[PDB]
Ligand binder design. Structure first.
Ligand code: NA
Length: 227
């Protein structure tokens, strides 16, 4: 795709999120850079409204899959870069087992040289004393596979995957993710064969930062089709 060309170097990233979970409204801004040749993302996210009212790990999946490293033999399956620069809309529902759900809508597109992810998030049906609002999740590394399928009807893709968040008591909190992506333009995109994105991250802190924030280092690699 011509879009793929926009990702051959290091690209600045800007993320903006407006959230409302159970009436607790918050905003997050993120900045960093992506190097899709290596599937690599380095970002710092800041809560700009004060303290974040949900755990940072619950927002990781929401807070730019156009930065995945696609193997050469799979580059015909990279929907995300093929929709650039006009971009795509990503929507998810995230069901936290035995608790509430997030619904998200993200618009991902270039503004000049910067890849921008503008997100709205709504959470409903949460327990004030459950694992999310009651801050019971661990901050350990999240990894897993995002299973992608083509959606010819919307000229896009669907995806599904589960995140198993470790909880303090030693069990896990499931977050079942359902995803759709639709291009913004009218023209053709790459509609992929079934495959997945193998995604891993590590969370850290900026020692100089006094605001509530998270630093993330992430690698995203497409896989599952053999040469
Ligand atoms: Na690159």
């Amino acid at each position: 795709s011509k879009g793929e060309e926009l990702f051959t170097g290091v690209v600045p990233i800007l993320v903006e999120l407006d959230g409302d979970v159970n009436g607790h409204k918050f905003s997050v801004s993120g900045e960093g850079e992506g190097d899709a040749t290596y599937g690599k993302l380095t970002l710092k996210f800041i809560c700009t409204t004060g303290k974040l009212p949900v755990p940072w790990p619950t927002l990781k999946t929401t807070l730019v899959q156009c930065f995945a490293r696609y193997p050469d033999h799979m580059k015909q399956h990279d929907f995300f870069k093929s929709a650039m620069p006009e971009g795509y809309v990503q929507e998810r529902t995230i069901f936290f087992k035995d608790d509430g759900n997030y619904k998200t809508r993200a618009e991902v597109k270039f503004e000049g040289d910067t890849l921008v992810n503008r997100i709205e998030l709504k959470g409903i049906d949460f327990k004030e004393d459950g694992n999310i609002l009651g801050h019971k999740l661990e901050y350990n590394a999240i990894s897993g596979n995002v299973n992608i399928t083509a959606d010819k009807q919307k000229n896009g893709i669907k995806a599904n995957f589960k995140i198993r968040h470790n909880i303090e008591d030693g069990s896990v909190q499931l977050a079942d993710h359902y995803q759709q992506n639709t291009p913004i333009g009218d023209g053709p995109v790459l509609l992929p064969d079934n495959h997945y994105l193998s995604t891993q991250s590590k969370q850290s802190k900026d020692p100089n930062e006094k605001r509530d924030h998270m630093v993330l280092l992430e690698f995203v690699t497409a896989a599952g089709i053999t040469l």
